Structure 1
C-alpha cells in the first residue's frame, strides 16, 4: 500500500476470517475438520477436507434446513446447534467420513458454548472426534431447558408469536429422535 516494500496480509487475514496459526495446527491431524460456525440467527456445521485448489466440503448441515425435518423453533440456540451438528454428522457418516477434529474458527472455547454443542451432536451421530466431556453443556441446557425456565419468568412470551409460549425442550427430543433413523438426506 505505502510502497514496494510494504507487506500486505493474506486475504483471509485481512478479512479477519482465518486464523492461520490455528489452521496449521488443525491440519496437523491429517483428519477432516468439523467446521463449527455461527450467525446471529443460524448455526452451520461442515466437514471439510484439504484440496489442491482449496478446501472440499464433504458434508454439511445448516440450522435452517433443520425445519425440513420438523423444526418449528428459533435456530440460534443451543438445541439448534446440537441438532445441526448431529445432522451434519449423520450426512458425514453417509459420505464415508469416520473422524474429524473440531475447528471453531475465531470463536472462543467457552464451556457449554454452541460450538461444543455442535461437537457433541456430530460425535453422537457417530463421528469420532477428539474432545473433552466436561467442557460441554449438561444435556439439559442442550435440550433447551435454560430457555424454558427463562420463559417461566414470563409475564410476556419469550417468543414473538413463534411456537408455544412456555417453549419446548420436548420438541428437541422429538427431533433428535427423528434424526436417529431413516429419513431422507441422511
Structure 2
C-alpha cells in the first residue's frame, strides 16, 4: 500500500476470516475438519478436506434445511446447532467419512457453546472426533430447556407468532428421533 517494501496480509487475514496459525495446527491431524460456523439466524456445519486448489467440502448441513425434515422453530439456537451437527454428521457418514477434528474458526471455546453442540451432534451421528465431554452443554440445554423455562417467565410470547407459546424441547426429540433412521438425503 505505502510502497514496494510494504507487506500486505493474506487475503483471508485481511478479511479477518481465517486464523492461519490455528489452521495449521488443525491440518496437522491429517483428518477432515468439522467446520462449525454460526450466523445471527443460522448455524452451518461442513466436513472439509484438503485439496490441490483449495478445500473440498464432502458433507454439510445448514440450520435452514432443517425444516426440510419437520423443523418449525427458530434456527439460531442450541437445539438447532446440535441437529445441524447430527444432520451433517450423518451425510458425512454416508459420504464415507469416519473421523474429523473440530474447527471452530474465530469463535470462542466457551463451554456449552453452540459450536460444541454442533460437535456433539456430529459425534452422535457416528463421526469419531477428538473431544471433551465436560465442555459440552448438559443435554437439557441442548434440548432447548433453557429457552422453555425462559418462556415460563412469559407475560409475552418469547416467539413472535412462530410456533407454540411455551415452546417445545419435545419438538427437538421428535426431530433427533427422525434423523436417526431412513429419510432422504441421509
* Displacement after TM superposition at 1:71 (Å): 0.0
* Displacement after TM superposition at 1:39 (Å): 0.1
String of CA shifts for 1:9-41, please: whole Å, max 9, x gaps.
000000000000000000000000000000000
Task: Provide the aligned C-alpha RMSD in A.
Answer: 0.1
String of CA shifts for 1:106-159, please: whole Å, max 9, x gaps.
000000000000000000000000000000000000000000000000000000
Aligned match of 1:115:
115
Matched residues, number: 186
Gaps (5+ residues) in structure 1? Answer: none
* Ranges of 4+ aligned residues in structure 1 off by more than 6 Å: none
String of CA shifts for 1:65-112, please: whole Å, max 9, x gaps.
000000000000000000000000000000000000000000000000
* Displacement after TM superposition at 1:165 (Å): 0.0
- Tell me the TM-score normalized by structure 2: 1.00
Aligned match of 2:81:
81
User: d(CA) in 1 for partners of 2:113 and 2:138?
Assistant: 11
- Tell me the TM-score normalized by structure 1: 1.00
Q: Secondary structure at the match of 2:6?
A: coil
Gaps (5+ residues) in structure 2? Answer: none
